[PDB]
Amino acid sequence: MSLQMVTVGHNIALIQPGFSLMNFDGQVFFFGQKGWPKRSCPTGVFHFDIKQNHLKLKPAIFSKDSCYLPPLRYPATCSYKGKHQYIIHGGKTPNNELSDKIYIMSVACKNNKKVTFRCTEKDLVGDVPEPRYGHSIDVVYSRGKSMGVLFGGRSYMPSTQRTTEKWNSVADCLPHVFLIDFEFGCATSYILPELQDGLSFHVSIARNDTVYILGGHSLASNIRPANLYRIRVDLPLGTPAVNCTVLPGGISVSSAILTQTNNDEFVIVGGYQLENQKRMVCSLVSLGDNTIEISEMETPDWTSDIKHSKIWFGSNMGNGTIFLGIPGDNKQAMSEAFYFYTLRCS
Amino acid sequence: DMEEDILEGMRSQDLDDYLNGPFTVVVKESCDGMGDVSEKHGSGPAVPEKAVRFSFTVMRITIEHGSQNVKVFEEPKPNSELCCKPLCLMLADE
Numbered sequence: 001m002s003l004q005m006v007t008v009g010h011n012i013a014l015i016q017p018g019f020s021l022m023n024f025d026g027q028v029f030f031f032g033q034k035g036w037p038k039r040s041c042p043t044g045v046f047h048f049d050i051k052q053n054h055l056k057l058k059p060a061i062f063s064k065d066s067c068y069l070p071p072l073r074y075p076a077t078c079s080y081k082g083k084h085q086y087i088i089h090g091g092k093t094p095n096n097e098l099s100d101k102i103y104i105m106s107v108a109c110k111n112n113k114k115v116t117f118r119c120t121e122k123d124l125v126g127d128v129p130e131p132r133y134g135h136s137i138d139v140v141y142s143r144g145k146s147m148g149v150l151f152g153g154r155s156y157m158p159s160t161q162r163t164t165e166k167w168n169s170v171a172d173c174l175p176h177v178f179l180i181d182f183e184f185g186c187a188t189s190y191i192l193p194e195l196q197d198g199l200s201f202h203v204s205i206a207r208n209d210t211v212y213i214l215g216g217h218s219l220a221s222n223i224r225p226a227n228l229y230r231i232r233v234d235l236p237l238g239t240p241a242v243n244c245t246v247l248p249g250g251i252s253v254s255s256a257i258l259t260q261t262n263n264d265e266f267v268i269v270g271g272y273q274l275e276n277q278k279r280m281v282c283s284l285v286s287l288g289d290n291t292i293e294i295s296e297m298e299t300p301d302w303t304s305d306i307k308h309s310k311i312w313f314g315s316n317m318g319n320g321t322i323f324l325g326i327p328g329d330n331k332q333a334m335s336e337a338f339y340f341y342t343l344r345c346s
Numbered sequence: 347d348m349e350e351d352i353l354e355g356m357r358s359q360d361l362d363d364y365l366n367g368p369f370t371v372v373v374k375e376s377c378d379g380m381g382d383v384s385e386k387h388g389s390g391p392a393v394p395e396k397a398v399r400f401s402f403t404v405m406r407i408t409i410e411h412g413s414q415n416v417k418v419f420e421e422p423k424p425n426s427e428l429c430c431k432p433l434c435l436m437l438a439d440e
């Protein structure tokens with residue numbers, strides 16, 4: 001809880017609400033810039049190197065057999081830390097159309113602060129989930145195997161009820177649970193009767209056999225379910241099985257950022273409480289063997305700007321460090337389009 | 347709006363007023379991001395704001411009389427101030 005303002009280089013405008021910060025061995029990489037990829041950086045990815053409160057967005061090449069992926073804006077990013085690699089699912093192509101491909105980010109070659117990524121296009125079969133954004137995917141382990149739990153987020157209307165006078169309206173996807181096999185890219189949808197209403201922009205914490213879904217926004221009624229869910233999974237010799245349990249003490253937040261401050265101990269920072277109240281309080285989530293425990297922590301001191309501005313975003317860098325953003329006074333002495341902050345958490 | 351003009355066109359082309367052939371229309375599409383469309387309401391020259399106007403222009407109308415396409419209508423001043431029908435307009439950088 002040590003806030004600290006940051007200064008950005010020349011290509012500052014690339015950072016936009018919805019950016020991703022992937023992480024490889026303490027080396028952070030910005031993804032999801034604004035506008036299609038330029039020619040000064042053909043791929044979109046960037047070394048997100050912060051030193052002395054100054055970050056240098058540096059271009060970063062791909063491999064020779066990778067696949068150039070568009071800059072998405074609200075993907076599902078899960079760290080399949082098993083040959084470290086990330087999984088990207090869905091998002092908003094700069095043409096405001098949603099995507100459904102899965103992308104796999106590995107590192108094919110590195111030499112003295114010069115990385116060469118490898119982004120491969122994994123496609124799904126079976127009960128493929130809907131092209132959507134705002135959702136959340138997490139890799140969960142069971143009985144020596146792994147699987148991907150994807151829980152719904154909002155999307156565009158289907159190709160039937162999509163009129164052009166409301167072409168951009170969005171509906172929360174049905175609250176299913178998608179189990180995704182990466183070894184074959186196979187999807188399987190399960191309708192947990194305990195999950196009722198649609199949910200997007202939530203927070204999902206995986207602990208080695210479960211998924212703790214928490215907070216989020218429910219557009220079907222414009223509320224924020226303060227509940228939470230524990231999706232227990234188990235992988236038999238044949239068809240997997242899932243169960244859910246509601247628990248008390250759930251936060252009421254959407255767009256809250258997550259990072260793993262300590263081993264089996266997460267922090268969570270402000271999303272939004274009400275459409276006028278940005279969330280200020282920070283909450284530490286003590287995981288464990290079976291029992292989650294959300295609690296409140298030392299209310300980090302927010303500067304004047306952060307208490308003035310009404311929207312604010314960011315993501316975790318990976319080592320208990322949350323990078324933030326603030327729009328900045330429009331009617332001002334040519335205030336920049338975005339100011340940026342960083343919060344350590346030890 | 348140009349009903350009367352294209353009726354006069356069919357008259358001039360020695361056709362029937364009461365002809366309902368499949369009139370093929372040829373429309374032009376034009377989008378141009380004009381900039382600095384703001385004005386100082388009070389004190390402070392601060393903010394420049396831009397705009398975009400997507401518009402079209404009915405460029406020609408042609409009926410397929412029998413087995414030939416006759417030009418029932420052609421725009422006199424195609425790229426003129428006052429035939430570019432506005433369609434959409436927004437306040438946003440191009």
Ligand SMILES: [Ca+2]
Pocket residue numbers: 378379380
């Ligand atoms: Ca122009």
